[PDB]
Structures are given as structure tokens and as C-alpha cells.
Amino acid sequence: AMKNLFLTSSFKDVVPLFTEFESNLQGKTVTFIPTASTVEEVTFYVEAGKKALESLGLLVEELDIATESLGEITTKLRKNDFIYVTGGNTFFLLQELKRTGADKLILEEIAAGKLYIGESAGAVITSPNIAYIQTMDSTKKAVNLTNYDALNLVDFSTLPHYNNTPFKEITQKIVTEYQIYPISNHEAIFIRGKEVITKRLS
């Protein structure tokens, strides 16, 4: 029904675009999902994003889909105002969302009007299918995921870090090979229903 999404390559690089997107943040709560990052070896974006949210007066509540009961997943997703998904390995993220059936719970919340913030991997899973991201994120880390169909919230396939080192050749080759929607580190996509707008911080 409703669809409020903020998609980014790097949340810490576009904080002002987020505050342009959404007002009266003080005291609002965020379900913060770092699952994609838990199989990654370099993860500065996780704390950078969390501290950025906190600097806006948001109350951040962690939810690791990989380890928490469905009871806790259901409760947190329902309770908190926003959903935020950190970057990391997109395949592991989608794998854990499907395994728990939480992909469904996220879609329901979004349909009810809940704001979804997706960073890199968290943006990629809004696409119909994440196969296109396999040259950036290794499938070796998702040993159970048998189908790359994702949330299918938008018809387009967000490609983060576009023409941004160290993903220059990677992102270039993806465009060539594959409705790819490229965004750089300082771009965000504002989505309010059918209204889709790219903004750049510069």
C-alpha cells in the first residue's frame, strides 16, 4: 500500500539528505539491522551509520535477524518507527530474512507506512532479484539461499557505490551486463509511493 524508502550507498555520507527527507526525528525509534555486516571483514559503515542516527536524536535498537527469535523480530519491527538495514553481504542478508520469514514482516510494515532505510546491501534487497550484485558481494557467505528473488519493492535494481572507488570496475561491468538504478556514495533515492527522486549532496 504505502511505500516510504530512503536508499543510500553510505548513510554516513548523506545524513543531510535524510533530514531533508524526514522531519521531527527527535525521540523516534529505529530497528537497526546489521545482519549483512556480520559476515564481512571490514565494517566501518555500521558504527558510522549508528552514530549518525544517534546524532539526529534517534533511539537505535539493534535486531540481528540471524540470531533472534521470530517473536523478537516481529515485536521490534512492529514497535519501532523506522527500519534501518546496514550494508554488508547482500546474499547473507537476504538468506537470513527469508529463513526467518522476516522479509514478509518488513514488507507488511512498509505497506503500513513505516519508513525503510536501506544502505548498500539494504538497498539492493529492495530490487526484484539480487543476482546482479554477485560480483560485489560473494555468494560463498550464503550457503542456504537458493533463490535470489528479493523484496521486489521497486522495479529497479539499485547499484550502490556507482563509479566510486574501490567499486569502479565492478559497478561499470554490472551496468554493461545488466532496470539498473545507479547511485554514488553521495547520492540517495527518496521514495514516497510512486514518487522516486535521486538527490546528491555536493
UniProtKB/Swiss-Prot annotation:
<keyword id="KW-0378">Hydrolase</keyword>
<keyword id="KW-0720">Serine protease</keyword>
<dbReference type="GO" id="GO:0008236">
    <property type="term" value="F:serine-type peptidase activity"/>
</dbReference>
<dbReference type="InterPro" id="IPR005320">
    <property type="entry name" value="Peptidase_S51"/>
</dbReference>
<protein>
    <recommendedName>
        <fullName>Uncharacterized peptidase Lmo0363</fullName>
        <ecNumber>3.4.21.-</ecNumber>
    </recommendedName>
</protein>
<keyword id="KW-0645">Protease</keyword>
<feature type="active site" description="Charge relay system">
    <location>
        <position position="161"/>
    </location>
</feature>
<comment type="similarity">
    <text>Belongs to the peptidase S51 family.</text>
</comment>
<dbReference type="Pfam" id="PF03575">
    <property type="entry name" value="Peptidase_S51"/>
</dbReference>
<dbReference type="InterPro" id="IPR029062">
    <property type="entry name" value="Class_I_gatase-like"/>
</dbReference>
<feature type="active site" description="Charge relay system">
    <location>
        <position position="120"/>
    </location>
</feature>
<dbReference type="GO" id="GO:0006508">
    <property type="term" value="P:proteolysis"/>
</dbReference>
